[PDB]
Design a protein around this ligand. Structure first.
Ligand SMILES: [Mg+2]
Ligand SMILES: [Zn+2]
Ligand SMILES: [Zn+2]
Lengths: 1150, 9, 89, 7, 99
């Protein structure tokens, strides 16, 4: 039967505070600007730190010391006046100051447009003049020539006065404004303004009335009284939040708020004294204005006039400045490679582990007889007495820690590992996860965190384990995969060779082959056929191959032994490649499953490293092989250049043409020497059995590393072999003379100097790039954060198709890569006629995708977030596969964040690119701005030469016709009537995303944005699923604008969320009422981010003061729907394991 | 603004 | 590790499993290890997850055990609990 | 030269 | 360096680096994002309450751990109570509400 409870907060209300409420907050009034006594250092009575008001300095102990124990609790000492309770209450209890004269709150005055000003219909200047005593503003005349609610001159004020008593009166300062606020009746005024909106004029009248009505209605509904914007009682913050404390040295340190409060109290008390002493009006005016200034300074410092300063060098910290985590059980250290580790493990230093796990260790040492009690356990453990170690081993058993490396760009920046205690001070990290952390061992450090609860630990072991996240949430490709040495090893053992030494051996199976390979006569593999049984065919569990003897290599034979156990014998023996190894791992993941693939990954690592070490791969100066052709090509280039010089001095060609020809000649020469380098390494001669010379790829280290994908690029390789090239000037122009030298030879000082510029520009680029990429990531996170998978399905077939995306070549960037992991929107069918392909409302699968590929090319159709009709989110089918773990995204997954991190993470790779990506995500109206996106579908050309408005042009659809006014200059591809293209877009320059939205609708914008973003990443060769970009685009298209109200309360031109107008429209239409007609609105990620309704989130984003004043005025309530609100609250977020909990609550509340 | 200036005036 | 994919297979949408595991572990911690088979190693979280893998715990079954447990709480009390309430009027 | 026409 | 529990700050009550107590690492916005994308609600909640500024939560967590237990009841982070009280001193009425 109702009644108050504990915690269980379901809502937060914000409102203007009445003086009554402010006094209800107050335990006592602070009457003195005293702090503490100079001698006793105890709090001065009735001052800012007084114990009678805020609380006892010491727990359960009154000031004079009469009552020192918890025996008395709630008791108030008769002698000293102090209640006996916990001193903690000094953080909670609040005071107040009673102002002798009202003072207007600064936020509701100086923030533009002023809320007080807007309510009272007073311009900033007038409100300033009245509040700060410059002029009197006549109020409530109810007759006479003089205008009510208007200002006046003193001589005028008097002259007027003479003409009538009990007429319009007005007292300068906050008293007048408070009077206007109390006396104004909002009901009557909304009535009047509503009558005013009837006025026949089209513009300038209805809009203003609409804004005024907006504010008025805000006040009407909220229930707050306008006069509350003027303060009578000014609240006083608890002392512990503005402390005066003794530092280490015995010196005192104080929060600036204490000083601000002191100025306030001083001026207020002095004002009371001056009033009681019947001071002249000039002095009382000065004091009142000073008081207003002091309150101003206390609330916001610097908003109005010069900010108050302790000293000129620093300004005081006001409440506004105050308004706008570090963790326990955490550590950090330098990281080192841990090759011997399993993917789910990490090396954790013993000392670190002893500190991190100390309470658990105490508990366990108490459970076992190792110590009598926790205290004894601690005293013992610091000693480090033996068996404490074994106990620590017992403690961390099955337990997992979190490892994190800054910057955390995506969710794999934090992963869970099972700790292996190790001697030494370094954290040992597994090599396969270095990619995901972007971690290397040149001195990087990582932080460790200990999940405490069973719930947290379960979250870590299930959701966060490195071994459970083997593939990128962005591209769906493996994230934890072999890199560097591993590849080098595998490639070394899987290499074609003349193989004269070990050729012609039947393996007797992988086992005997392995024995012999380790034995003798086999080195760097061999051209020998192996007997191993292969198979593992699927569509049946039986598997098995009757005969499996195939040409192979000792390393190749070895690989099959290494637990592949998932077919692809053909894939083996094809020689190792980094890309090939990644593909092998992925295929193994799909066919053979996750756990077993993890084991496969570990095996591939182990073997890769093992052979990598014994390969003997190294780099000598002679391993950088120059081409004899270089001197020839250089001589040729010199000759051609001389020919161009002679041809120039003749006057046949311009300076420009000559420059261009020189640059081109040199470019081609650089290509030539590159080719020569790569050719020289690429072919080699070795003796064949018969005696013939065979041509092998070669095992040269630069070449081997390059070909294997272990390390290197052709451009880099040519830098030690072939002539360097052309340098850029700082202006960007290309120097005439190239760098003939190559790093093996070494280059002249001038060449190096002329380089330093490029080098410097590079480092500066990367350094700035981290900062910019971070910003993009944060914008995307802020815009997409509320998105979550809210249900399995929403019931709409609607979706997009998507094309091959290749502009001309058509070769790459299409088909299954784009299609895979999606859901079919329609019963798509393979080939002409009979058709009947079997996937409808079905998640695309690799086997199914292969089916679609086999049956020629498919036009295709697909479920997408863009077309998802789910209210306040997306659904499992429309999203498709969770790319980190092949399956339909588990309900409750927070898609938005994942999207933001997926797009944001390779930000530093785009280079400065990234500005283009941000330009697209922010929906900028591109400068060239073109195309006649009129969709009238008809055309009648015209004129009316009025500058830009000259061209004009008219479309003439059979039903109706319209007129658009263009701009001088430019050209058109289609001219004069006939409506050549219904799409039109006659002018060149790329349509604005907004123009594209109005003319072509939502689907076209989703297509355009996704493809145009993808162009950038592709140009940088980065793999990213369209899905995330679709999430973000969906957030961009969130807003809609009403064209016709219908039967609803909504106004024409009013903007509102898609979901809200859809729900409303279904309500009306199912209620038999005319639905609202609406038009799609597209806003960039910034504007969308700034859009969100909840005030805790918004205020925690940016622009805290504005958000908080508007919220407080409107009397808003935060329902805690999103993540930010709950995080701030310290609540369990409505996502993941929390998503399940949140729903039950939401339902219970409704 | 500037109460000093006002007061001097 | 621990064949986690199979454990998640036992309970769709990953998240739920975690809660179940956690809840089960709490039970284990609160009173009597008891339960289903008994690898007897790697603490409460691993034991709960492994138990889940053999569909031993189950989301519904745990609820059934609790509901029966509520009846067990009913047991004892009963007439003696009815005594405390009947005495007062 | 290398990166940035440097390298 | 590493820390289990240790010195806390006066106003914020967040873990603070002492002279013998190492202090604590910063779990920032991006790390929070990381935990959110994992849908790890209780880990995040631990970061935001028991492991940082909540006196009751951290004392209860420590005691529970040395006695062997599940996560303790959260309490609003002390810095949120600080924010609320600071907004009250600004003169705007802030009200925690029931369902
Ligand atoms: Mg590094
Ligand atoms: Zn006393
Ligand atoms: Zn959907």
């Amino acid at each position: 039967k109702a009644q108050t409870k504990t915690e269980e907060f379901d809502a937060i209300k914000i409102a203007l505070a009445s003086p009554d409420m402010i006094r209800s907050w107050s335990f006592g009034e602070v009457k003195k600007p005293e702090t503490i006594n100079y001698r006793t250092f105890k709090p001065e009575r009735d001052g800012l730190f007084c114990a009678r008001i805020f609380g006892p300095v010491k727990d359960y102990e009154c000031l004079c010391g009469k009552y020192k124990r918890l025996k008395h609790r709630g008791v108030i000492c008769e002698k000293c006046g102090v209640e006996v309770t916990q001193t903690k209450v000094r953080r909670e209890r609040m005071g107040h100051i009673e102002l002798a004269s009202p003072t207007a709150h600064i936020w509701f005055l100086k923030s533009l447009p002023s809320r007080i000003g807007l309510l009272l219909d007073m311009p900033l200047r007038d409100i300033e003049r009245v509040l700060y005593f410059e002029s009197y503003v006549v109020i409530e005349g109810g007759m006479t020539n003089l205008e009510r609610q208007q200002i006046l001159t003193e001589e005028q004020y008097l002259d007027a006065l003479e003409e009538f008593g009990d007429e319009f009166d007005a007292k300068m300062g906050a008293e007048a404004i408070q009077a206007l606020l109390k006396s104004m009746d909002l009901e009557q005024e909304c009535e009047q303004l509503r009558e005013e909106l009837n006025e026949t004029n089209s513009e300038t009248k209805r809009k203003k009335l609409t804004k005024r009505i907006k504010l008025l209605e805000a006040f009407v509904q909220s229930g707050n009284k306008p006069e509350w914007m003027i303060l009578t009682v000014l609240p006083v913050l608890p002392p512990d939040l503005r402390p005066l404390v003794p530092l280490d040295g015995g010196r005192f340190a104080t929060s600036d708020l204490n000083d601000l409060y002191r100025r306030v109290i001083n001026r207020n008390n002095r004002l009371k004294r001056l009033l009681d002493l019947a001071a002249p009006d000039i002095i009382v005016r000065n004091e009142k204005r000073m008081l207003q200034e002091a309150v101003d300074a206390l609330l916001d410092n610097g908003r109005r006039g010069r900010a108050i300063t302790g000293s000129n060098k620093r300004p005081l910290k006001s409440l506004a400045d105050m308004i706008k985590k570090r963790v326990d059980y955490s550590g950090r250290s330098v990281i080192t490679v841990g090759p011997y580790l399993r993917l789910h493990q990490c090396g954790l230093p013993k000392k670190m582990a002893l500190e991190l796990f100390k309470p658990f260790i105490y508990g366990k040492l108490e459970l076992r007889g190792l110590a009598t009690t926790i205290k004894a356990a601690k005293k013992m453990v610091e000693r480090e007495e033996a068996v404490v170690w074994d106990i620590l081993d017992e403690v961390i058993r099955e337990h997992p820690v979190l490892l994190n490396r800054a910057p955390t760009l995506h969710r794999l920046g934090i992963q869970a590992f099972e700790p292996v205690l190790i001697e030494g001070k370094a954290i040992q990290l597994h090599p396969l996860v270095c990619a995901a952390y972007n971690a290397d061992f040149d001195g990087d450090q990582m932080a460790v965190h200990v999940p405490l609860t069973l719930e947290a630990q379960l979250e870590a072991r299930a959701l966060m384990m490195s071994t459970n996240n083997i593939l990128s949430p962005a591209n769906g490709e493996p994230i934890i995969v072999p890199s560097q040495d591993v590849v080098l090893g595998l490639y070394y053992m899987t290499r074609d060779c003349v193989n004269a030494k070990g050729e012609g051996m039947v393996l007797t199976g992988p086992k005997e082959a392995e024995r012999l390979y380790r034995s003798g006569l086999a080195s760097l593999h061999a051209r020998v056929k192996v007997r191993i049984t292969e198979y593992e065919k699927d569509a049946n569990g039986e598997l098995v191959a009757k005969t499996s003897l195939k040409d192979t290599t000792v390393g190749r034979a070895i690989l099959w032994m290494i637990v592949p156990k998932g077919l692809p014998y053909s894939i083996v023996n094809q020689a190792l490649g980094k890309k090939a190894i990644s593909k092998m791992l992925n295929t193994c993941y799909r066919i053979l499953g996750l756990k077993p693939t993890v084991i496969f990954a570990d095996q591939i690592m182990y073997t890769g490293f093992a052979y990598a070490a014994r390969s003997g791969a190294s780099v000598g100066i002679d391993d950088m092989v120059i081409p004899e052709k270089k001197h020839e090509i250089i001589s040729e280039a010199e000759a051609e250049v001389a020919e161009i010089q002679e041809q120039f001095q003749s006057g046949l060609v311009t300076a420009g043409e000559r420059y261009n020809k020189v640059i081109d000649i040199w470019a081609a020469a650089n290509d030539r020497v590159s080719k020569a380098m790569m050719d020289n390494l690429q072919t080699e001669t070795v003796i064949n059995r018969d005696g013939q010379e065979e041509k092998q790829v070669s095992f040269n280290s630069i070449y081997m590393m390059a070909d294997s994908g272990a390390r290197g690029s052709a451009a880099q390789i040519r830098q030690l072999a072939g002539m360097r090239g052309l340098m850029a000037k700082p202006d960007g122009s290309i120097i005439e003379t190239p760098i003939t030298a190559n790093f093996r030879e070494g280059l002249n000082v001038l060449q190096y100097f002329i380089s330093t510029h490029g080098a410097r520009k590079g480092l500066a680029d990367t350094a700035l790039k981290t900062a910019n990429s971070g910003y993009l990531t944060r914008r995307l996170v802020d815009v997409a954060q509320d998105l979550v998978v809210t249900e399995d399905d929403c019931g709409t077939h609607e979706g997009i198709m998507m094309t091959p995306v290749i502009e001309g070549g058509d070769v790459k960037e299409p088909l299954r890569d784009r299609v895979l992991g999606r859901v079919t929107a329609e019963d798509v069918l393979k080939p002409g006629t009979a058709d009947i392909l079997v996937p409808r409302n079905t998640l695309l699968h690799e086997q199914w995708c292969d089916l679609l590929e086999e049956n020629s090319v498919d036009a295709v159709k697909v479920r997408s977030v863009v077309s998802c009709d789910t209210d306040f989110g997306v659904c499992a089918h429309c999203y498709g596969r969770d790319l980190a773990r092949g399956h339909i995204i588990n309900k409750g997954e927070a898609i938005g964040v994942i999207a933001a991190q997926s797009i944001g993470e390779p930000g530093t790779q785009l280079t400065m690119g990234l500005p283009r990506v941000a330009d697209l995500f922010e929906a900028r109206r591109p400068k060239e701005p073109a195309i006649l996106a009129e969709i009238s579908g008809i055309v009648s050309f015209g004129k009316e030469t009025k500058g830009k408005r000259r061209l004009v042009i008219t479309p003439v659809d059979g039903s109706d016709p319209y007129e658009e006014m263009i701009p001088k200059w430019r050209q058109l591809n289609v001219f004069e009537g006939e409506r050549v293209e219904r799409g039109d877009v006659i002018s060149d320059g790329p349509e604005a995303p907004h123009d594209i939205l109005r003319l072509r609708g939502v689907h076209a914008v989703t297509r355009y944005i996704v493809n145009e973003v993808q162009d950038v990443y592709r140009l940088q060769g980065v793999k990213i699923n369209d899905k995330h970009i679709e999430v973000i685009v969906r957030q961009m298209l969130r807003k809609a604008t009403i064209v016709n109200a219908g039967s609803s309360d909504f106004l024409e031109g009013e903007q509102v969320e898609y979901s809200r107008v859809k729900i409303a429209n279904r309500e009306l239409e199912a209620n038999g009422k005319v639905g609202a007609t609406y038009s799609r609105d597209l806003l960039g990620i910034t504007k969308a981010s700034l859009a969100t309704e909840s005030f805790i989130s918004a205020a925690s984003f940016q622009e805290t003061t504005r958000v908080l004043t508007e919220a407080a005025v409107a009397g808003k309530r935060d329902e805690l729907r999103g993540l930010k609100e709950n995080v701030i609250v310290g609540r369990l977020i409505p996502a993941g394991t929390g998503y399940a909990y949140h729903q039950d609550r939401m339902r219970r509340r409704a | 603004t500037d109460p000093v200036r006002m007061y001097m005036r | 590790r621990v064949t986690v994919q199979d454990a998640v297979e036992k309970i769709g949408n990953r998240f739920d499993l975690v809660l179940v595991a956690a809840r089960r572990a709490r039970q284990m911690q609160v009173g009597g290890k008891d339960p289903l088979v008994p690898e007897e190693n790697d603490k409460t979280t691993v034991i709960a997850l492994r138990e889940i893998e053999e569909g031993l715990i189950n989301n519904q079954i745990l609820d059934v055990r609790e509901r029966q447990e509520q009846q067990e709480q009913e047991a004892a009390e009963l007439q003696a609990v009815t005594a405390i309430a009947e005495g007062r009027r | 030269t290398x990166x940035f026409x440097s390298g | 360096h590493a820390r289990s529990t240790g010195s806390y700050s006066l106003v914020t009550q967040q873990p603070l680096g002492g002279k013998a107590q190492f202090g604590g690492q910063r779990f920032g916005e991006m790390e929070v994002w990381a935990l959110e994308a994992y849908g790890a609600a209780y880990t995040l909640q631990e970061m935001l309450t028991v492991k940082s500024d909540d006196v009751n939560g951290r004392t209860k967590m420590y005691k529970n751990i040395v006695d062997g237990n599940h996560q303790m009841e959260p309490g609003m982070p002390e810095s949120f109570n600080v924010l609320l009280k600071e907004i009250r001193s600004l003169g705007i009425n802030i009200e925690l509400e029931d369902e």
